[PDB]
Design an enzyme around this catalytic site. Sequence first.
Site: not given
Lengths: 393, 393, 393, 393
Positions: C88, C349, C379, C381
């Site tokens: 991400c 996203h 953030c 993953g």
Amino acid sequence: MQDVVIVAATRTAVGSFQGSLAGIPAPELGAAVIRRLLEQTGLDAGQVDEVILGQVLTAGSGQNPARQAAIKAGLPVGVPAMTLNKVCGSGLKALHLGAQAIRCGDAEVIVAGGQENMSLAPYVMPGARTGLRMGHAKLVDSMIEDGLWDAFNDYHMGITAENLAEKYGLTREEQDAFAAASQQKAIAAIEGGRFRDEITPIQVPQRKGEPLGFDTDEQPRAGTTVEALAKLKPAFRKDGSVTAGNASSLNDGAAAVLLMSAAKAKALGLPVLARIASYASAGVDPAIMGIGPVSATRRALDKAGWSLEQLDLIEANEAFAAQSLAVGRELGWDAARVNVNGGAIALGHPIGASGCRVLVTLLHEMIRRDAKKGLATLCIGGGQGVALTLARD
Amino acid sequence: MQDVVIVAATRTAVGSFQGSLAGIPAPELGAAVIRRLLEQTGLDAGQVDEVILGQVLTAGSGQNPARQAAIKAGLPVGVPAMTLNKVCGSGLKALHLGAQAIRCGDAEVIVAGGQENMSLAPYVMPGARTGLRMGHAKLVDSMIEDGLWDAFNDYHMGITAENLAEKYGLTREEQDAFAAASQQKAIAAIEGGRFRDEITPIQVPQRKGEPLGFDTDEQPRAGTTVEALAKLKPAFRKDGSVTAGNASSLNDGAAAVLLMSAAKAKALGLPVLARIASYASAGVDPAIMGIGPVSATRRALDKAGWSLEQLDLIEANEAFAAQSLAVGRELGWDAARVNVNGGAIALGHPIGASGCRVLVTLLHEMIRRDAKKGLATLCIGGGQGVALTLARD
Amino acid sequence: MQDVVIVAATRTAVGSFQGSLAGIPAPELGAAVIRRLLEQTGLDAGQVDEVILGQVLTAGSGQNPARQAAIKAGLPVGVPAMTLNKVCGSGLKALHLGAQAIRCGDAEVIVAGGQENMSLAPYVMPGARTGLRMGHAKLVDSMIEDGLWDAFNDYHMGITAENLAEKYGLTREEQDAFAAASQQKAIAAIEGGRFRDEITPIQVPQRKGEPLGFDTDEQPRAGTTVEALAKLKPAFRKDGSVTAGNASSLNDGAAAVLLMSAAKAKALGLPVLARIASYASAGVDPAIMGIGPVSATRRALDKAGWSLEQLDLIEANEAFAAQSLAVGRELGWDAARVNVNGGAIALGHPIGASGCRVLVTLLHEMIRRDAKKGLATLCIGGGQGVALTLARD
Amino acid sequence: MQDVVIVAATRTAVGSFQGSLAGIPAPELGAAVIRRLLEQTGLDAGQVDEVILGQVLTAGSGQNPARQAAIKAGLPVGVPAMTLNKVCGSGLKALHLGAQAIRCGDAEVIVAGGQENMSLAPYVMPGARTGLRMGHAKLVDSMIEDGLWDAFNDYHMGITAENLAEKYGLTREEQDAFAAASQQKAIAAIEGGRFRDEITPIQVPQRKGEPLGFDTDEQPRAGTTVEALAKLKPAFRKDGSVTAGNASSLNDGAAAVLLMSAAKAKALGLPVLARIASYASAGVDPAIMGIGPVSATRRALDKAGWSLEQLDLIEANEAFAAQSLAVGRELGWDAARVNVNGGAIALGHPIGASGCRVLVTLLHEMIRRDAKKGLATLCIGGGQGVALTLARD
């Protein structure tokens, strides 16, 4: 109406899963046994009226597997062919359909049997045509889904065997003892040459060199004992009694007979190996499909006017030791007359061929022993049975 | 040997590829037509002796599609069932097998027909079981490979049609004229309510809402003209005459009949819709499989003791306009008596059901016309034909 | 050492899953934003020293997706390119690597950002290379496996969001309120023209006709309220609070900036949009990956010598409402300065691009408001975070 | 700006395709080399600031392969990680990124290198997500598509080698001579224990038994001769000169170094193995990607202030003999100083690891020779090159 006779009967040796026949598509195994029947009788290929072949696992096999076997065997384009699927009973039901066509005068000569290459059964991808959209998807083993899984209860054939072990209070030890005796009988029959007359060798293409002859059943396991079998884990249910060692295996093979009217056999001057006395199908609950042979056998004996004790020899296909012992409990047959050369636990269950494989084994052992009356019967996934009787003078 | 009679006959409407039936597995289509035959006759399900269903495309369908249709229709587990594959002829050959069983006294009541869902035929991954090793690999369309591709010549059914167009000198214009007439006749029949009596509605589950009834054939293309067909590109070969507009389509549907002995129909008090007077199979060169109906028709007429001139009404399955024209040229039949409510170019070719679909359409039209003598005939991929005759008093 | 500036910044509108960009491979989206940066500056393509592009989902994408974008944009073969994956955070970490190359004098001009087409992420078939042998197998959704699934805990990113909802006692209603405000802010920004300057239209090829311009973010849902959101079922856990409506969606898009040394920008006479004040990465427990922005933000603020209250504007990527509210609890930021034009719950996203998408949104809103200090943070993953600061005089 | 030093360097042995490492996912190979670097230096895992790993083939690998290697090696969750893809150059470019971070003061300690398991690269099914509709479809070998195929010219890396053989007039005989020498030199190095110091053993799980240690490079082919290479068929083009014997192979392995600032190494009391004196990337025509090392090498030498004549030792990755010969012809280097222990034709090309694999081999040989100046350089699919220089006092 015509009487129906068998003038030729042959099978491949039965290959193990990814064994000797693992590279040879089912219709090429069928073609090899069709050629042998015509060689054994000296019959002109043009005299065949129809080819009827069982095959269960046909995903990506191409149009009409039975027609592929007939054409590859060198039968003229004028011979019609059809494929059938009665799952485990396909290869015997083929003889029932051929007998019917001959009885009512639609045909005088029929090639009937079955063929299966479980090694070559492919994976299948449902939903890829229209879109999986998102989420992990199931790549389906067609052999399991189409061959070994119950469509109604959503469990394996092996659970149907657990159901019969429960119903008849059959122990792990009884099932293992049956499995070991099947192994012992199959190895004795192979070593004693009892399968030489019935087997057509397959010339198997190699990576390098000339083809190697495959002519010897390769599923049987030397050194099978109740003590070795006792160590296996249950294959289908946590506290179950059915294992890979007391269940039939996954296998490749073909088997076929040349059916004629008695009148046509006589006109050609061909010796008759046996007459077909009767045939029958039955249905039972899919949850206990392994019991299908009981009603199928009783209907076939009733149609022939026979009692069970008149049978000299019985071939009762061994889907699972539990299934076989359950059939024997219901029928009260003499186990010493059943699968005398071993059964499918040792020799294998090439699904669509097995019905004809056990019939070919029955016929050759009837000729060897000069038996007068024999029975071939199989249970069928989805809750069915087939049975067929043979007579000799 | 008993007369074989039809006491009930019904079919689904035919769905287009990914059309109204695209979510309904073939055996659920079969279940719906079996239920309707019992409802129409008020026959208890226990009176059925066997279910015989054609289905060609069985990859990942589960054990014994015919048995799945029989159980889902509420037939008791005691009723045996078998699936067959004679490709395009499967649905008619099923009635030949049912006729044989009744003629031999093996049965009194048989459900016979066929079922197909081409929309749901999956992709197959050969070699995934043993290892692809390296290199891009072929993900196989099982509908094409198992349904539409010649196993001997490695080309599409459509090339067999080109072979017949070349051999008979059938022009693009004559093929498009035949196709336009098939469309015009089917649309007129639908709008006229001509198929109402023969169609069983399917309740199609919807993403949201109560199910929607599907009861109207959806393949026919309204306002088809030769001028519009003249613009299409050849579908199979660069300079070919065969197009998407003069070829059959891809489709979903099922069709079945309730066969009885004359004696059993009488004992139940059921009126006879028609008698099966004869049936036959034939084999031809796979390269010109579309000509199979010529010898199949001639054999069925010979077995009935009828001449072609005695037929009132003919259903000759339209695989391709070129194929249908070639058969008409060889037999010399009156085209005005052939496919009078349209054929497969307009209505669709749900492979394993088509054989019974055209028989159902033949029988309902014979009743409205008071026709005494009728023929249903199909060409078959792989070089075969089937034919069956109906008589009415 | 060189100071690093942004002289051009642009993004595609963000496509919904199987939406407007669903047919356009990720590197073609990258190519379109690279071309726009060079158009906006009048820069000769030969002046670019490197292309650094994030892309997470690269199964079957071909060699080096970043090189494909650079070549397709018309950059000469002499410009080197690399692809990166920090999941991400990829699209923001690309700017960190470009800043590093410029700071130490390895380059003067860099294209940095990210690109993702989640619609086109394929299914993957592990084990088919070496052999599945037997048993049903898993056809893997690469988007889920490579983009959305934790490699250590074997659960979805959404479970990491449930973990933060538990840790911070965040209610369903608080998460829905955050989701509704993101929707409301995104629709107001779109209708108010706040995204026009930052968006490069994509000419989307149609089935028929000329290409249609896609220039308007299509993920936002009019009529999103806490009352509608209250009806949704939990998407990841039975008694959970995270739903499809308070989670980010699946999306397609690209975004990139043109980085230079301050010295190179001045020599070319290009106006500076913002300077990069600092950047940082952090690691956290994968089980609470959504908290990654807290330490990443504190490290970036520490490197810039800033306090949180000096930030005029914050773009904190909205993986999940729970994740965003947890970050806000830890940092104690003024929520009125965060995602003022809406966030990923409304806008989407597109994993590998999102890091640059939120940076491009930050920069344009900083210019509009004459903001002096801004922060972009995401953030990641697997338990990471990235943060980058921008300054204007 | 800080000197960047190497304080530890190690690699797996290189596995052959479906050889000893065929069951070990790329990140577990990376974990093993990261663990070894910490063991050799006695460094606490918390001292690592980042993990930067190359890996090209990531289809179904899960989120962030580099992060998976870092966590599996026992690095704390606080250590950030990123994966990169510069195809064949990934494993060396990782050290360039690590060098930049240390030179900017963003880090003091970086693990840098690459990891690849080609054996485990899966098949991909494009179009399954949205629907294949009909027709046979392509199941994509992701190793070929993402690793070995040019995205611009639609042919294999091997055709880029043919393009260089044609352009430089490199004969089959000269290519086979180069390949034989690579094999002879690698076998001599293995047998001599030359790779013992640089190899981390992998404990390979066995179907039955305790794990087996894999610590010996298994790609080299003993008793290779020019006479044997002369008999092979061209691998990529009918009348080509490039074969399986004069091309690199498909392989599995990982390699990493521990980079520090000079200051941090001193503060820890760790001896410096080498200093990174420079590094560079270059872009060339994709059609002749094998020539990438020429400009990459020239740029790296210019950045170090070195001439080619000053290099004691060179590792130039052997993608193909034709490619290696072309680079040698353009640069005019002394072949006696190039790949002195063999190269990728013999040892293998585990794509994303090769860049660090050759750097590890360079560094260990520089120490044994007391070489002061060393170069590692690779060509890159898509038309790129990387080069990095090592200095010792």
